[PDB]
């Protein structure tokens, strides 16, 4: 045929479902990894949607942790606090190590001497 036509199909980015992450780059990365002999167009769109939600969810909790520390810029400590806060995030990112992270304020009870430190019989050794 080879008949000239105007733009009938959507001449937009491949993330036509309102997604912000590029599904096209995910598609070629899937081909780069040689994961499957044939790659459908559904996989890059589905993968980006999961990634976009995961990216937004962590930053939402990281920003909340930033507010607790009274900071505007999200630092790795805020990201680590979000991961170690919920069990679902902790289980998924179990043995991973974050750069420039911290340690949650977890303390055992046996290390706080508060009951009559004087002595156990009377008010001194």
């Amino acid at each position: 045929k080879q008949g000239g036509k105007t733009r009938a199909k959507a001449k937009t980015r491949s993330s036509r479902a309102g997604l912000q992450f590029p599904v096209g780059r995910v598609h070629r990365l899937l081909r780069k990894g040689n994961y499957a002999e044939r790659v459908g167009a559904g996989a890059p769109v589905y993968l980006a949607a999961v990634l976009e939600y995961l990216t937004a969810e962590i930053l939402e909790l990281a920003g909340n942790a930033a507010r607790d520390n009274k900071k505007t810029r999200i630092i790795p400590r805020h990201l680590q606090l979000a991961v170690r806060n919920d069990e679902e995030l902790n289980k998924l990112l179990g043995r991973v190590t974050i750069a420039q992270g911290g340690v949650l304020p977890n303390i055992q009870s046996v290390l706080l001497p508060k009951k009559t430190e004087s002595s156990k019989s009377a008010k001194s050794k």
């Binding site: 069990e87 902790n90 289980k91 179990g94 043995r95």
Partner: protein, 94 residues
């Protein structure tokens, strides 16, 4: 006399090559767990034995870890403390 045949049980059970958990209660046990996730699941003879063997070996490996926890605390029995510590240190608890 108490605890004497426990050592004898070590010799027999560690060269026996069998399963210790009753197979029929385990057969109904896998159905109950699987049914809640999805309904109308048919099992296989190999599937039950494969699932049982992994579970039994996991318990044996777990019990050995708790054994080292008892000697650490100058103990001979496995209190629930030993199992809880082993699960956390091995990372299986979370």
């Amino acid at each position: 006399r108490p605890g004497t045949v426990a050592l004898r049980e070590i010799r027999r059970y560690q060269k026996s090559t069998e399963l210790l958990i009753r197979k029929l209660p385990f057969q109904r046990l896998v159905r109950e767990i699987a049914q809640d996730f999805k309904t109308d699941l048919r099992f296989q003879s190999s599937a039950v034995m494969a699932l049982q063997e992994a579970s039994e070996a996991y318990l044996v490996a777990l019990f050995e870890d708790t054994n080292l926890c008892a000697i650490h605390a100058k103990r001979v029995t496995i209190m629930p403390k030993d199992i809880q510590l082993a699960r956390r240190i091995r990372g299986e608890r979370a």
